[PDB]
Amino acid sequence: DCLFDGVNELMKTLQFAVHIPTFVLGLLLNLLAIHGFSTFLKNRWPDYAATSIYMINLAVFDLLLVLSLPFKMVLSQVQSPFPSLCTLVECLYFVSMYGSVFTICFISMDRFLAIRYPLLVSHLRSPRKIFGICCTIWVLVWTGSIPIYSFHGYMCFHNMSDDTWSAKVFFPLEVFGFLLPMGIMGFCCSRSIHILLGRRDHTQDWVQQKACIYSIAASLAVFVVSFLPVHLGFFLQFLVRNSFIVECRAKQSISFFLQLSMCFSNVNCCLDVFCYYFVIKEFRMNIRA
Amino acid sequence: VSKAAADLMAYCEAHAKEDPLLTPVPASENP
Amino acid sequence: DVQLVESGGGLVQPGGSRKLSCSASGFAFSSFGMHWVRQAPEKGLEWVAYISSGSGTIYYADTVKGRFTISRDDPKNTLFLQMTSLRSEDTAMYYCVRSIYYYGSSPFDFWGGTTLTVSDIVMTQATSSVPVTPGESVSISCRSSKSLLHSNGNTYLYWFLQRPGQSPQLLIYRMSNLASGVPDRFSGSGSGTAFTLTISRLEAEDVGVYYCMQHLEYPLTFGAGTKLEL
Amino acid sequence: ADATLSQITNNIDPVGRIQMRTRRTLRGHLAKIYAMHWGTDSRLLVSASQDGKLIIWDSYTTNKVHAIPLRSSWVMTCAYAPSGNYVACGGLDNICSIYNLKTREGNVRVSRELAGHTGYLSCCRFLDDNQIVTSSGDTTCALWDIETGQQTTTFTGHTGDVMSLSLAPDTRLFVSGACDASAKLWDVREGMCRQTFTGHESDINAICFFPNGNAFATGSDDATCRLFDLRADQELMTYSHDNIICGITSVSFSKSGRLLLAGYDDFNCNVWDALKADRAGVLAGHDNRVSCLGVTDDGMAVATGSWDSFLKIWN
Amino acid sequence: VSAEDKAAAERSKEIDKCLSREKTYVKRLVKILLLGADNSGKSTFLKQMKGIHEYDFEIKNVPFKMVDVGGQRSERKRWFECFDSVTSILFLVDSSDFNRLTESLNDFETIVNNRVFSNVSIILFLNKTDLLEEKVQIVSIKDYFLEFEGDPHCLRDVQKFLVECFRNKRRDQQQKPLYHHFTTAINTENARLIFRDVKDTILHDNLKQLMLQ
Ligand SMILES: CCCCCCCCCCCCCCCC(=O)OC[C@@H](O)COP(=O)(O)O[C@@H]1[C@H](O)[C@H](O)[C@@H](O)[C@H](O)[C@H]1O
Ligand SMILES: *[C@@H]1O[C@H](CO)[C@@H](O)[C@H](O)[C@H]1NC(C)=O
């Protein structure tokens, strides 16, 4: 038989060591990012409103995940006599995560559209379209999320049902949460970088956009380090739940990898403030005075 | 200079009664 | 020059249908609302229908409601009146009347003429005729049911004159203002419920039938015809 | 000079803070507003916008009564005839266009196209139904009759470009400010300058006449306004603030002359107390530089026009 | 609101609809202000494709308006502030000319260093370049320019030196890009270059709007 007492004995303390300062830093970081960008919606509306919309959307998704962190923290060691608090916490956790993912993907798509066709989007770019896009992002996340956690439930974020790890509910997750967003991020970043570097022949002043050729090159990077191992662990765990990998000293390592990747992906709510919000000079001057 | 200033003050005081911007007009009388 | 020419009339059997057309040459027809005003034989004027400049607001008369249609053709600069299920009381002398509504505007100025024969504020003038020798000022009085004075200081009273064998022309608009191209002898005054028209001198041109109309609300009701003659 | 204006006016009680609110906002133009003029009826106003548009409004009900396209988009000034039949316009085309609003056709057409100024037209103000006074960037002013269009009298003597022009209530004299940091008082009937004043150290951008016709306050780009008296032949008082470092685009005087309204380049306007030489009110609500500012004939409302394509009526 | 006030309100609604119908054209319009010289060849350049002229045309379904102010241009800031909304400023120079290079450089420095056009890109055209090679062969460059370094008889070196001297007048580089071109008096491909530069300026505007940096 396979006993997972050691991996759990280690992973409890690992969560207690990594997640607490992650939540502590992310809470203040998002509470500063939101207030910092709320100024641009009251005094710099016609210029930066379109960006501030999805920026604030991403910030509030990160804040929702940060606030959901301490509840799984509490319910990772003790059981509360309630079958609804775990469901609510799981739903909030995963909704915030896969909402931030979609928001980042849409940010990359919007940048690529604004770059590839500047004259076309000089007219068809208003905060009404972006408000509708954020609304449909929330709507799609909720409708694709609730019918998953409705079939989850002895503890919280442990021992999922035997239909949660089925092909009909795991393949859509992998396809719609990693494959397509990663491909879109890669295309919309590589094409944008190549286009922005091809401005050298148009005008020698391309050096004026040096920073613009690095921020996207950061976006294409901190996205891999916070989403690739997590879905790799998801795929491995799905592999070991339908009679494909059965051996001791291996399933333990896969459980450890998946738990650790899920504990380390939660620092993306803290790395997104540096990726997107801190590379903006106006943000730096606004929050530092 | 003093005479011109005195005349300006006298003209201002004479016509100060009919300044709708200086004295808040009532809403009923407000156009 | 302004020229409204109306055609399409004639003799119609009872219960039939017809179309009256009006060309509007010599002015910006797109910016002017249009009215239809008929005149029964040996009778006064009565408003029929009205269409705005943009053909957005359309008004009819209770007698012709659901029976008359009014349409505008801006590219062709024409006005159309389609009449169906006619009765013997539809015999009149239709006129197309210009109008335009902004601040300081003077609607109901230019008219026309056409003939059709078929086989509510109360405005009336009790005096059928006012014979008077020339040389002395003549006063014409018109009575109203409601008060034409508005809260903004406007009095929607209209004084028109029709000469024998001619078409009506606007004398005074809004009870206190004279239309362009009019002698200075004419004047108008009055209170909110009472009005009066004063003529300083009388000539062969001034003899005719005077009419009073209100524009406070639709339908617009004419008064009686005061026959000023020597 | 014996006694300063401030010394005499020290005995006068301060006016205090006045709050003027936007009763109605006039919108519909698609570009920056460059000029406006108040009609004699105190209800109709004409405004010019750099999208080549002229709009006459109904200030009481925010009703668009007239909308006239312009031949040249680069228009800097507009005017309203005292009798209310014609409107004037001008700009970079060195031509003053007079439009007649009472055509029997039902539309508004250009009554005349006066030409003859070397530079761009910078101000036009009607004298009567058949006369107009204009100023140009060729450092001169002119008097025109619209019956023929010939320059009845050309006023020369300005070194820099003339910027603003205002007419006396009696319509017999006027004053003009230019870029030579000086203001000249001209006589319509005579035709040569009589008084010249040089107190500012920068280009004068606006000028206006006191309602009594014996004094005038003018503003320049040095963020100061200065009041001059015709009989005194000397500067009376300077209205300026340390926090104000932006030039003055327009000026206007109240009916009694107690409150002087001046538009600045800091996205708002100020209401100074002329006698007390102290700030009295602030007109804010424009998200761009205010270009034109006008006090109505009755003294009830005040109209302001800025670069945000919005016109604001205050009371 | 009486029966006649409703009609006035309807007329105002029609007028407002007419004004709003053309609000797309003013946004779609692309403005280029021409600030060439007398000997630069502005008249010939215009014919190939204070009197204020406006030339309106359409390139690739994009409306372009060129404002020519040749004849009289004032130095007052009020006059120049009328052109703060133009998309680009075109500066035409005579490459083959020798004595007028300093005056054109001074004019370019005065135009660029003004705060009015801080949000306007600058396009540079060097016309009559077919005679430039003959002029540089007959008379060298180092004679008329002490600071010049390189081969005085190399056309590429002369063009690079001219471009560097023109671009050195830009006090600030962060505001908007500065472009350049070399065309003759008989070529008919300047419209494509103008459209490309306008597209580059629009892309820069969108990049600044996206707050990517
Ligand atoms: C349409 C796309 C977007 C829609 C919104 C997002 C919806 C989906 C969100 C992701 C849900 C993915 C499924 C849950 C994964 C998870 O959080 O999984 C817990 C892991 O821990 C795996 O462990 P699990 O399968 O629960 O069971 C082990 C014990 O937990 C452990 O303690 C023991 O040691 C082991 O042997 C196992 O028994
Ligand atoms: C998971 O839950 C099932 C169903 O109750 C149970 O049989 C199994 O032992 C549990 N696994 C654990 C607690 O590791």
Side-chain angles (χ1 to χ4, degrees), chain D residues 52-71:
Chain D
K53 263 294 177 322
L54 209 81
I55 291 195
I56 297 146
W57 323 66
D58 190 3
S59 87
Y60 275 19
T61 88
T62 321
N63 228 295
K64 274 183 188 29
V65 50
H66 279 130
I68 326 160
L70 304 178
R71 295 182 184 277

Side-chain angles (χ1 to χ4, degrees), chain A residues 111-122 195, chain E residues 199 202-203 206:
Chain A
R111 277 164 183 177
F112 163 66
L113 288 206
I115 273 179
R116 187 31 195 81
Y117 324 87
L119 288 160
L120 192 52
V121 312
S122 278
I195 285 184
Chain E
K199 210 152 52 157
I202 288 324
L203 187 136
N206 284 352

Side-chain angles (χ1 to χ4, degrees), chain C residues 179-192:
Chain C
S180 268
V182 88
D184 221 323
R185 48 169 182 276
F186 282 98
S187 187
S189 34
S191 36

Side-chain angles (χ1 to χ4, degrees), chain A residues 48 51 54 110-111 114-115 118-119 121-123 125 196 199 202-203 205 208-209 212 280 282, chain E residues 27-28 167 170 173-174 177-179 196 199-200 202-204 206-213:
Chain A
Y48 310 139
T51 310
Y54 40 58
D110 157 56
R111 277 164 183 177
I115 273 179
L119 288 160
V121 312
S122 278
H123 316 80
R125 174 151 210 290
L196 267 204
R199 258 167 100 254
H202 302 310
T203 168
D205 276 29
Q208 203 216 116
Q209 299 302 96
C212 263
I280 289 147
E282 293 120 39
Chain E
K27 173 163 201 211
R28 271 208 336 268
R167 223 145 75 91
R170 254 209 301 166
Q173 199 213 58
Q174 198 117 41
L178 194 138
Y179 322 93
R196 167 204 314 266
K199 210 152 52 157
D200 193 69
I202 288 324
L203 187 136
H204 189 266
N206 284 352
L207 282 193
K208 251 52 204 206
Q209 156 173 149
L210 259 182
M211 71 205 318
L212 254 162
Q213 86 180 41

Side-chain angles (χ1 to χ4, degrees), chain D residues 34 64-65 74 94 221, chain E residues 11-12 50 54 77 81:
Chain D
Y34 247 80
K64 274 183 188 29
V65 50
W74 321 93
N94 328 308
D221 270 299
Chain E
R11 149 178 185 105
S12 190
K50 185 196 289 91
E54 293 189 28
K77 40 169 196 43
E81 94 209 355

Side-chain angles (χ1 to χ4, degrees), chain C residues 34-114:
Chain C
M34 304 316 277
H35 307 246
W36 277 103
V37 167
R38 70 194 252 198
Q39 155 147 4
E42 299 297 279
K43 276 309 281 198
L45 312 143
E46 46 163 314
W47 171 77
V48 171
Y50 152 74
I51 191 158
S52 41
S53 70
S55 161
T57 43
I58 298 177
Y59 293 107
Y60 307 94
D62 320 330
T63 312
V64 307
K65 215 142 173 91
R67 234 163 77 257
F68 278 24
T69 324
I70 165 158
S71 34
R72 174 204 216 86
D73 209 326
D74 265 347
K76 319 293 160 224
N77 270 9
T78 298
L79 193 80
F80 302 92
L81 177 96
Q82 168 79 43
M83 323 172 322
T84 170
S85 271
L86 290 173
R87 340 178 174 157
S88 147
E89 52 111 346
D90 288 287
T91 297
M93 181 85 78
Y94 278 81
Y95 307 116
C96 184
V97 195
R98 269 206 325 182
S99 288
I100 177 151
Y101 308 94
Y102 51 85
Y103 187 80
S105 197
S106 100
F108 275 83
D109 45 47
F110 210 73
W111 303 51
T114 188

Side-chain angles (χ1 to χ4, degrees), chain A residues 40 43-50 127, chain E residues 209:
Chain A
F40 290 158
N43 322 265
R44 309 212 128 79
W45 159 271
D47 296 81
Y48 310 139
Chain E
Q209 156 173 149

Side-chain angles (χ1 to χ4, degrees), chain D residues 52-252:
Chain D
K53 263 294 177 322
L54 209 81
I55 291 195
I56 297 146
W57 323 66
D58 190 3
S59 87
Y60 275 19
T61 88
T62 321
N63 228 295
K64 274 183 188 29
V65 50
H66 279 130
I68 326 160
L70 304 178
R71 295 182 184 277
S72 174
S73 146
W74 321 93
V75 280
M76 298 165 72
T77 52
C78 78
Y80 220 132
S83 60
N85 328 87
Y86 308 94
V87 299
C89 93
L92 281 199
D93 51 300
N94 328 308
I95 271 180
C96 185
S97 265
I98 320 283
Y99 284 90
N100 170 45
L101 312 159
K102 308 304 187 46
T103 77
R104 271 261 278 157
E105 192 98 340
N107 50 34
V108 41
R109 53 169 136 274
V110 71
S111 154
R112 204 171 270 283
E113 188 128 61
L114 314 150
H117 260 301
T118 279
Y120 63 93
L121 205 85
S122 156
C123 201
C124 48
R125 211 54 86 216
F126 267 99
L127 257 191
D128 83 76
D129 226 15
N130 203 54
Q131 264 161 124
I132 184 145
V133 193
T134 57
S135 65
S136 179
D138 57 29
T139 77
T140 203
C141 323
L143 179 65
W144 310 65
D145 90 340
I146 84 173
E147 177 47 58
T148 38
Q150 263 67 271
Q151 293 224 350
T152 307
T153 311
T154 324
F155 307 90
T156 81
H158 259 158
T159 286
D161 295 7
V162 197
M163 302 262 89
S164 100
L165 166 140
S166 212
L167 277 162
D170 41 315
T171 73
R172 284 291 189 263
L173 272 77
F174 58 92
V175 72
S176 267
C179 279
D180 53 349
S182 299
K184 305 241 184 202
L185 184 89
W186 315 85
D187 182 282
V188 189
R189 293 174 68 182
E190 282 284 315
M192 59 319 295
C193 189
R194 334 171 80 91
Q195 321 193 312
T196 307
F197 308 98
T198 305
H200 299 249
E201 329 283 330
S202 170
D203 309 7
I204 276 155
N205 274 265
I207 214 156
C208 71
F209 253 138
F210 209 76
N212 87 319
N214 258 258
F216 64 110
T218 181
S220 314
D221 270 299
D222 43 11
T224 81
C225 308
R226 291 170 187 270
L227 188 105
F228 304 92
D229 188 73
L230 265 55
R231 311 184 265 160
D233 208 42
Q234 272 183 15
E235 188 211 36
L236 275 206
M237 182 68 33
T238 326
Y239 320 134
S240 59
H241 207 178
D242 281 40
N243 247 21
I244 295 271
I245 52 134
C246 324
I248 290 97
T249 38
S250 46
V251 282
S252 212

